[PDB]
């Protein structure tokens, strides 16, 4: 039972970017299967370089373990905006990060956060957002809308589901 893990941590990325994705730390050859098809990669971690449309997908790890990973899953964008989650699935109590990020990393002003269209209440600084103690009601459909160059741009949405600690 190990685990893919990315650095960056974001899974949802632009277009030409990078991530590396990582299987669990107990391993010392691997398996990767991108949308269930055994990769060439056998290494511990499998990079993604300038990303493209084909990246996107679901990623599994296999280790010595006789027990594929849970699957992590990958989506290239192309936008002036990304809203970007640590995880899409949250368990109550953990924290929430996100990110309005924009594209070739231009800055991004005036950021603002929706959660199902009304603007999030909770304080935040420019473009990064972290909700300390998720709890079931920080689930919602989100994006964000901030000023890049002259003009002003939204993300596209993102849905966000806060599940219980429990098994
Ligand atoms: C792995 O499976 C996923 C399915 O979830 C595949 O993702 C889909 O791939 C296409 C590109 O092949 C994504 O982009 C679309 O491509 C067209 C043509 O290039 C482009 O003009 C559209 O604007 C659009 O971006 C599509 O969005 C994407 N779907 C998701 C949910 O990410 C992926 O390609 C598969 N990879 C392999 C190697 O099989
Ligand atoms: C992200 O989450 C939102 C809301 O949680 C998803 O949109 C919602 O999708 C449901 C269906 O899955 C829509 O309800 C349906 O409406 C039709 C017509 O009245 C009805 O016949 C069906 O039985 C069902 O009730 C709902 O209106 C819609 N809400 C909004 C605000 O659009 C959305 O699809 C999710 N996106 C992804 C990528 O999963
Ligand atoms: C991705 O990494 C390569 C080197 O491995 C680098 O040349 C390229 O600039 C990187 N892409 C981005 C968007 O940083």
Same mark, same amino acid.
Not at 144 to 160: A, R
């Given at each position: 039972?190990?685990?893919?893990?990315?650095?960056? !941590? @974001?899974? #949802?990325?632009? %277009?030409?970017?990078?991530?590396?994705?990582?299987?669990?730390?107990?391993?010392?050859?691997?398996?990767?299967?991108?949308?269930?098809?055994?990769?060439?990669?056998?290494?511990?971690?499998?990079?993604?370089?300038?990303?493209?449309?084909?990246?996107? $997908?679901?990623?599994?790890?296999?280790?010595?373990?006789?027990?594929? *990973?849970?699957?992590?899953?990958?989506?290239?964008?192309?936008? @002036?905006?990304?809203?970007?989650?640590?995880?899409?699935?949250?368990?109550?109590?953990? !924290?929430?990060?996100? #990110?309005?990020?924009? @594209?070739?990393?231009?800055?991004?002003?005036?950021?603002?956060?929706?959660?199902? $269209?009304?603007?999030?209440?909770? @304080?935040?600084?420019?473009?990064?957002?972290?909700?300390?103690?998720?709890?079931?009601?920080?689930?919602?459909?989100?994006?964000?809308?901030?000023?890049?160059?002259?003009?002003?741009?939204? *993300?596209?949405?993102?849905?966000?589901?806060?599940? %219980?600690?429990? #098994?």
């Amino acid at each position: 039972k190990p685990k893919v893990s990315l650095n960056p !941590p @974001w899974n #949802r990325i632009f %277009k030409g970017e990078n991530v590396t994705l990582t299987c669990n730390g107990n391993n010392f050859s691997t398996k990767w299967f991108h949308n269930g098809s055994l990769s060439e990669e056998t290494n511990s971690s499998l990079n993604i370089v300038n990303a493209k449309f084909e990246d996107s $997908g679901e990623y599994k790890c296999q280790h010595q373990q006789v027990n594929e *990973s849970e699957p992590v899953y990958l989506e290239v964008f192309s936008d @002036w905006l990304l809203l970007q989650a640590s995880a899409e699935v949250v368990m109550e109590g953990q !924290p929430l990060f996100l #990110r309005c990020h924009g @594209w070739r990393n231009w800055d991004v002003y005036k950021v603002i956060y929706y959660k199902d $269209g009304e603007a999030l209440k909770y @304080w935040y600084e420019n473009h990064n957002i972290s909700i300390t103690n998720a709890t079931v009601e920080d689930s919602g459909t989100y994006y964000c809308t901030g000023k890049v160059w002259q003009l002003d741009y939204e *993300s596209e949405p993102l849905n966000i589901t806060v599940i %219980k600690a429990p #098994r």
